[PDB]
Every structure is written in structure tokens, then in C-alpha cells.
Design a protein around this ligand. Structure first.
Ligand SMILES: NCCc1c[nH]c2ccc(Cl)cc12
Ligand SMILES: [Ca+2]
Length: 223
């Protein structure tokens, strides 16, 4: 997250870290046994880390649980990033409490102008590199479809939306991939792609979760 603030320990209780010997992607806990992330985060050998703030220190509220199955969306296209969404099943159910909690799926799509919260452990610089150990947060609005399409001509499908600031300076970044965009208490987006971080006229692009609720629900019911 570039231009954000320190969330505070366990104030984003649905935020997960995906770990393969090191943090490599974010994700969101949607019930006691399932995580949603970005399809471009796929790899084998994933451990899901819940209840994290400092990802390099054991602070006492962590739960570490291995993934038993991963399911990339059937129409994911890695060249265009269309349908950038994946489900991860935990080998055992997480123990839910005030610091580890699921986030609700949406019943309707959010409109442009809605304020959202984006979080992750990604890079905090737009030029250069500095990775934080504690979770960073950013409040940002959903942008209109016309502004999003004008910023990324020919690249925005109906499964994407833009959120952020056309002036630049605030954005998600490398290592925030897969993380949540939460608006009005519902999961509306997944950190997906962009052109750099926090550049002028190049806001972040996010997977439009409301388009996938039926697929998520059916998949969880049969796996
Ligand atoms: N708005 C963040 C978009 C994003 C997702 N994965 C990334 C990897 C590298 C860089 Cl420079 C940016 C990204
Ligand atoms: Ca920790």
C-alpha cells in the first residue's frame, strides 16, 4: 500500500497472508474453511496465515493452516487477467473470534463514489522498494466505469473496476495482490493489477466480486 496508514493489530480480521516460505499474496476469509484470493496468486504448497499483524513476529493471535485444495476460476485468462479470482479450502476450519472473522459476500454490486478499505503488506513506495512488516490500510473510492476505461483503453472488462485517485500518490502495490477491497461491510473487490503503483492517471484495477457470488456459492457447496 502506497500512501496509506498503519491499520492497527487485528483491526482487519478477515485479512489473510498466503505463505510459501514467505508472504507472497493477500486474501480474504469468507467462512471458517474458505479463502478468496486472486488467480494470479496461484501456486502449490500454500499455508494460510490468519490473525496476522507483524508477519515476521509471532504475536499470539495467529492461526496457521495448510490449504487442502485450490480452485482457479474456470475462465481465468492470465494474459488479460480477466476473471482473476481463486478459492482456497483450508485443511481444517479456522477458529472464529473478534480478531479472526469472515467477511460477507455482496448481494449487489457497489456503485462508483462508494468509499472502500484496501489492505495489505505490499510495497509502500512508488519508486523504489520498502516492504512493511505490519498491515497497511487505505481508504479509496470506486471510480466511474468511464474514467476507468479512459485510463486503460481496451483493457477493462465487465469483471473489473477501478478504485483510487486519478491524481496518484495512493494505491495498492506489489505484494498487495489477492487482498480485499471492502465497502460498506461487504467484499466487493480483489487486488488484481495496474500500471505501476500510485502513478498519475493510472488507478488500481480490481476483480469485481459481485459477478462471482453464484460461482463462489456453488463451488463451496460441492467441495
Ligand atoms: N495497484 C496494485 C496493482 C498490482 C498488482 N500486482 C502488482 C505487481 C506489481 C505492481 Cl508494480 C503493481 C501490482
Ligand atoms: Ca505474526
Amino acid at each position: 500500500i502506497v500512501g496509506g496508514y498503519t491499520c492497527g493489530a487485528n483491526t482487519v480480521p478477515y485479512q489473510v497472508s498466503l505463505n510459501s516460505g514467505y508472504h507472497f499474496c493477500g486474501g480474504s476469509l469468507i467462512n471458517s474453511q474458505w479463502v478468496v484470493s486472486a488467480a494470479h496468486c496461484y501456486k502449490s504448497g500454500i499455508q494460510v496465515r490468519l490473525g496476522e499483524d507483524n508477519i515476521n513476529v509471532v504475536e499470539g493471535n495467529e492461526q496457521f493452516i495448510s490449504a487442502s485444495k485450490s480452485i482457479v476460476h474456470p475462465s481465468y485468462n492470465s494474459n488479460t487477467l480477466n476473471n482473476d479470482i481463486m478459492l482456497i479450502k483450508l485443511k481444517s476450519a479456522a477458529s472464529l473470534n473478534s480478531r479472526v472473522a469472515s467477511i460477507s459476500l455482496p448481494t449487489s454490486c457497489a456503485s462508483a463514489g462508494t468509499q472502500c478499505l484496501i489492505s495489505g503488506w505490499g510495497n509502500t513506495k512508488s519508486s523504489g522498494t520498502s516492504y512493511p512488516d505490519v498491515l497497511k490500510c487505505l481508504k479509496a473510492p470506486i471510480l466511474s466505469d468511464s474514467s476507468c476505461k479512459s485510463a486503460y483503453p481496451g483493457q477493462i472488462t465487465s469483471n473489473m473496476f477501478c478504485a483510487g485517485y486519478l491524481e496518484g500518490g495512493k494505491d495498492s502495490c506489489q505484494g498487495d495482490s489477492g487482498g480485499p477491497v471492502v465497502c460498506s461491510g461487504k467484499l466487493q473487490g480483489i487486488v488484481s493489477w495496474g500500471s505501476g503503483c500510485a502513478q498519475k492517471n493510472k488507478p488500481g484495477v480490481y476483480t469485481k466480486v459481485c459477478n462471482y457470488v453464484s460461482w463462489i456459492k456453488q463451488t463451496i457447496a460441492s467441495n
